[PDB]
Amino acid sequence: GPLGSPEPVGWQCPGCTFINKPTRPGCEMCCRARPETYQIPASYQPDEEERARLAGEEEALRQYQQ
Ligand SMILES: [Zn+2]
Ligand SMILES: [Zn+2]
């Protein structure tokens, strides 16, 4: 999960400069729901674990709502 990296490509957290993943609707420190305004970078490229869970989550969530 979003443990932390030197060159993050997600969104920055105001409550703390942790910067979580772009596809992570919630900081792993403050738990502040990602701002809908924020967008995900096309060149994101989620890790093997990130995509493994993301691709599946959206397959059950996105497929429903979106
Ligand atoms: Zn936050
Ligand atoms: Zn935070």
Range of the domain at 1: 1-66
> How many domains, in total, are found in the chain?
1
- Spacing, Cα 55 to ligand 2 middle (Å): 24
> Which tokens go with 17?
């400069």
- Spacing, Cα 19 to ligand 2 middle (Å): 7
Q: How was this structure determined?
A: NMR
Task: Determine contact, residues 26/35, Cβ cutoff 8 Å.
Answer: no
Environment of ion ligand 2 (residues, CB < 5 A): 13, 15-16, 18, 27, 29-30
Environment of ion ligand 1 (residues, CB < 5 A): 13, 15, 27, 30, 32
Distance CA 16, CA 2 (A): 14
